[PDB]
Amino acid sequence: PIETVPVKLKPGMDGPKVKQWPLTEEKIKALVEICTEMEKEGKISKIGPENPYNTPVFAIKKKDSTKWRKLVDFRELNKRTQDFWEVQLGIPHPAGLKKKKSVTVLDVGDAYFSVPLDEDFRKYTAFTIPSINNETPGIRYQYNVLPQGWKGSPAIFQSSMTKILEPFKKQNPDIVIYQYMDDLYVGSDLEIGQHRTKIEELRQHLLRWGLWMGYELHPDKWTVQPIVLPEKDSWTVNDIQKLVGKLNWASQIYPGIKVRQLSKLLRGTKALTEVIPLTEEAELELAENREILKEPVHGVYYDPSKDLIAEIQKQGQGQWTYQIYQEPFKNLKTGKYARMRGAHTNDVKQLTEAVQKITTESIVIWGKTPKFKLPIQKETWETWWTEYWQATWIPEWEFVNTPPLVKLWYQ
Amino acid sequence: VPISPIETVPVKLKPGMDGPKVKQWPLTEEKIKALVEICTEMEKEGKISKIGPENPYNTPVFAIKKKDSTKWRKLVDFRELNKRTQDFWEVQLGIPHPAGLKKKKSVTVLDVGDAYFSVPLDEDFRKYTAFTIPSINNETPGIRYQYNVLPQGWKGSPAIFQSSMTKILEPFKKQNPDIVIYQYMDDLYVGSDLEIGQHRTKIEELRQHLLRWGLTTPDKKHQKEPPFLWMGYELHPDKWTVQPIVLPEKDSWTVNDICKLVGKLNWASQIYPGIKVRQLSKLLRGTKALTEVIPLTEEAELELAENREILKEPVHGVYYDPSKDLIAEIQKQGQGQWTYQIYQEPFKNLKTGKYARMRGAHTNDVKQLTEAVQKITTESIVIWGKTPKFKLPIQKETWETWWTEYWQATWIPEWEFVNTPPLVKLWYQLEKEPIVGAETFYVDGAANRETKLGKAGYVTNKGRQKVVPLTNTTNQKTELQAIYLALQDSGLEVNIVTNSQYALGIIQAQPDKSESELVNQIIEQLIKKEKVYLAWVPAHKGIGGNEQVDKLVSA
DNA sequence: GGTCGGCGCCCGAACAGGGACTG
DNA sequence: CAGTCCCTGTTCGGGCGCCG
Ligand SMILES: C[C@H](Cn1cnc2c(N)ncnc21)OCP(=O)(O)N[C@@H](CCC(=O)O)C(=O)O
Ligand SMILES: [Mn+2]
Numbered sequence A: 001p002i003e004t005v006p007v008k009l010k011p012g013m014d015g016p017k018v019k020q021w022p023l024t025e026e027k028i029k030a031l032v033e034i035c036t037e038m039e040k041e042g043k044i045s046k047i048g049p050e051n052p053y054n055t056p057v058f059a060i061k062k063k064d065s066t067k068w069r070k071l072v073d074f075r076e077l078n079k080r081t082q083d084f085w086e087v088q089l090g091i092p093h094p095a096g097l098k099k100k101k102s103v104t105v106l107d108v109g110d111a112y113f114s115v116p117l118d119e120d121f122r123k124y125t126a127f128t129i130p131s132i133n134n135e136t137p138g139i140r141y142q143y144n145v146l147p148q149g150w151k152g153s154p155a156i157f158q159s160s161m162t163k164i165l166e167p168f169k170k171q172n173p174d175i176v177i178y179q180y181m182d183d184l185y186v187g188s189d190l191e192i193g194q195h196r197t198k199i200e201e202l203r204q205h206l207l208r209w210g211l212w213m214g215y216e217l218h219p220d221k222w223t224v225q226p227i228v229l230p231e232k233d234s235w236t237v238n239d240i241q242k243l244v245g246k247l248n249w250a251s252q253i254y255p256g257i258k259v260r261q262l263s264k265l266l267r268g269t270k271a272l273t274e275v276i277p278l279t280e281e282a283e284l285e286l287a288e289n290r291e292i293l294k295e296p297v298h299g300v301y302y303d304p305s306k307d308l309i310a311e312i313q314k315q316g317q318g319q320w321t322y323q324i325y326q327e328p329f330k331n332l333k334t335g336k337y338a339r340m341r342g343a344h345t346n347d348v349k350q351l352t353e354a355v356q357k358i359t360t361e362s363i364v365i366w367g368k369t370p371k372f373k374l375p376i377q378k379e380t381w382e383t384w385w386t387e388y389w390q391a392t393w394i395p396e397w398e399f400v401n402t403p404p405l406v407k408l409w410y411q
Numbered sequence B: 001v002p003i004s005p006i007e008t009v010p011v012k013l014k015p016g017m018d019g020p021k022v023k024q025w026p027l028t029e030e031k032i033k034a035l036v037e038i039c040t041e042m043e044k045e046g047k048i049s050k051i052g053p054e055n056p057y058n059t060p061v062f063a064i065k066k067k068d069s070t071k072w073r074k075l076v077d078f079r080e081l082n083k084r085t086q087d088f089w090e091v092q093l094g095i096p097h098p099a100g101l102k103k104k105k106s107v108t109v110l111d112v113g114d115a116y117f118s119v120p121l122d123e124d125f126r127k128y129t130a131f132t133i134p135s136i137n138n139e140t141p142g143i144r145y146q147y148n149v150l151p152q153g154w155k156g157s158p159a160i161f162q163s164s165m166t167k168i169l170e171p172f173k174k175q176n177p178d179i180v181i182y183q184y185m186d187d188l189y190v191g192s193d194l195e196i197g198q199h200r201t202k203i204e205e206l207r208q209h210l211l212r213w214g215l216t217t218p219d220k221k222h223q224k225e226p227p228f229l230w231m232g233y234e235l236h237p238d239k240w241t242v243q244p245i246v247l248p249e250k251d252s253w254t255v256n257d258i259c260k261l262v263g264k265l266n267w268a269s270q271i272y273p274g275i276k277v278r279q280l281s282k283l284l285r286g287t288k289a290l291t292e293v294i295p296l297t298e299e300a301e302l303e304l305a306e307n308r309e310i311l312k313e314p315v316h317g318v319y320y321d322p323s324k325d326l327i328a329e330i331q332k333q334g335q336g337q338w339t340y341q342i343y344q345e346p347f348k349n350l351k352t353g354k355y356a357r358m359r360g361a362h363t364n365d366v367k368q369l370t371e372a373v374q375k376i377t378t379e380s381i382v383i384w385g386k387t388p389k390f391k392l393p394i395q396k397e398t399w400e401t402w403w404t405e406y407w408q409a410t411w412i413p414e415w416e417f418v419n420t421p422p423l424v425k426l427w428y429q430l431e432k433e434p435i436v437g438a439e440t441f442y443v444d445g446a447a448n449r450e451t452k453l454g455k456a457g458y459v460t461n462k463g464r465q466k467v468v469p470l471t472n473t474t475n476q477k478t479e480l481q482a483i484y485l486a487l488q489d490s491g492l493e494v495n496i497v498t499n500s501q502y503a504l505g506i507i508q509a510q511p512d513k514s515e516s517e518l519v520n521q522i523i524e525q526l527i528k529k530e531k532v533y534l535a536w537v538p539a540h541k542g543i544g545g546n547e548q549v550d551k552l553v554s555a
Numbered sequence C: 001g002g003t004c005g006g007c008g009c010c011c012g013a014a015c016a017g018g019g020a021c022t023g
Numbered sequence D: 001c002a003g004t005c006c007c008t009g010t011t012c013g014g015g016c017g018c019c020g
């Protein structure tokens, strides 16, 4: 008996038509049980080939979670409805969420199934379930309620969500709550003990309105990865050549970096392993270059109208560096990960973990997901990344192949 | 017209476009008799109905012979209607493979006679499916019908039939969960572990369940005893094989005959191990004429004779046992070619295959091996829904050195080393630190965009120098040439300093083959060396001999 | 015969995007 | 400075095979 909110595509755009990729046996069996139960509960209903739209579907398991979770790759549908969840029913991003001592993530995606979807828009939520060895044709479905993973679901449910959180926000005015996709970010400066207690108060407060899992964060402990120069008492020609090339590349970010006096030490055609003493002017140029790298870049600030871009570099030995920016050489944030799951054995699991950690930080700081430049081949990534995905959202990515230059982000 | 028991599928045209209006092409008098005989029988069965002059649409119609039968098949040239028909999403996601079949006690295969003619079409859409049957006389106005069922030739018929067929089989599969029904269009592969007594009953129950909706299962197409003819294979109780393949032998080969030859070789590669098409596919390149006669190269004739000798021996596959592991082993066939065998027991192959794509102008065996593993992984998930355990002709230490030191993220699933030459390895290793006691070469190269002239050379720490003029070259080719010069004129250990990101990025990827003859020469020199250390420095910064050698090669 | 859909392979042409140099 | 071009990779169009 609920009124449906009318939703339309962007002017001059059709629905998504993405082919379903092959799925493993454990994922298909999980999707059949889920889609049968969702069909029995009226959440989804079967359709036919007269619906020309389709969106891929697979299943995941969150961190330390045994239950399978249906996940739809609504990335193409979210692009074709962008003017809806930004212009009309936008969600504000609190700037104080990144400053809290502890932030917890709650999966509230099951609450979207309580609101019906606009009848004229259900045609675009179509998805197909594959079968092993193509025993049967594709079993197609479409959503009758607000789907999980669609950027229009939290916008429509925002009015219903605020009235559920109003009693809790009133009793706890210092706790910050942010909603992104199927996740609810609850942050507070409270002690770790009573913080989890306030989380359980919110879980029971949500169970009364018809809501589980907990992923803890600590944004105040997030550190950046600066550009560092070596500290050696005996420099060689090869050391100084690598030092000049690194400072020359870093000069694109810090315009005050100078390499004139250091290049004068490389005037002759010397052997690489030959020791070179640093002149008096070169020592001052290196020390001043170290002090510049401590200063923040001039004129770097986040623009809400610009997209976020994240580049990742493989540094070996389980080391992974990343930079987030909107304009080139104006990095809003740098960082480095180490000893993630699959370290020293699986690059794809390490890279998949890194993308999730980077995307989570971008949601807390700016409330936006970045487009990734992945250092991986397209076929290698599109073959394994679903085996390690543990998040209810999926960021956009492109594949790059940039051979290492002068190891700028890692000593 | 009676209502069909099957629920119709609502079909629309694309907005702002009318139905087709095409004139009927001339038919042979032997095809006209076949159409009038079929159109009269389908009209009696309610599959087509007459239309008056109020129907302004028309579409050509023809017919082809049925294979191994005297009956005919009615086809409509709906090429103009498909352009203006709404887009459909095909539910057929792939083709089933016998290597994915599990062993069952009983197996039954049955076809559906005139499958498209037993599924209704949307009443609001039957108008545009109008055709004209010409008579034996050109002056006779002819009889005009419209389709009340799914026509053959309309782009929506297969997608509608497959979804319609699935909806009819759903109540039977729901009541009989222990029955495996492989559904490909109308061809039904029914197998079960039930006893043979109850199996024939469930088969007859299925033949009666399909009969309630107008789907007839003729006893002519019924199959009760092995071998079963299913999807172009021969299914036996313990093995399977493809139906006999006939390679056409031609004294004079055309380009279209090569495409028909390569197509059957790719089809044979699914079970026949060791099929190559590298030399034969090299005949299809650079040629733009299907009917042009092309001579067979010496390498193409040898490759063809080897494929014919493989097709002489009989091969067979086995079925899938979910209780045992899946194993895939790869071998390095030729240069750029790879073959694999997927099996569970030794020499009992479930299926075979081959990989031979050339990705990039510069590659190595480890990259191509990684690409073959990924192709087999996705192929195995389609057929068996799981990733097999690999046996790879690459040392564990060799792979450990590659994936750890490579800048891209790369990975191979759970595998083990199988010692079957030729073994995949790395042919040279660039040092991570400069070499003590090795001559340091500062290389550089440049060229003019207009005159296409340039120089390339080096300057070393021991005073050695060289500059070579080059004609019809580019800045990239000269900088690659300068590194080649330093590799020629150096000892077994050499330190090279360049400012070319292009040249450095190619060499650091450790290629062993290249489309560029210059890079192949650089590779050959890198294998002869014992220690090579490459280093990059920025240009135009006055660094070492790189500035002195930049001014020497500037012209 | 020259109809449709699905999947596979092979090829070239068109497209797409970054270093390096020049007006 | 923007404009190229040299190089490389990707995507798509079209032929065949095979199945219904
Ligand atoms: C209509 C449905 C699918 N289908 C098969 N071929 C085509 C085609 N060329 N164009 C369009 N749809 C086609 O076919 C199943 P059927 O009708 O039950 N039996 C076959 C006879 C096979 C033979 O012995 O050759 C037929 O009559 O087609
Ligand atoms: Mn049939």
Ligand SMILES: [Mn+2]
Pocket (backbone or CB within 6 Å): B444, B445, B446, B479, B499, B539, B550
């Ligand atoms: Mn140069």
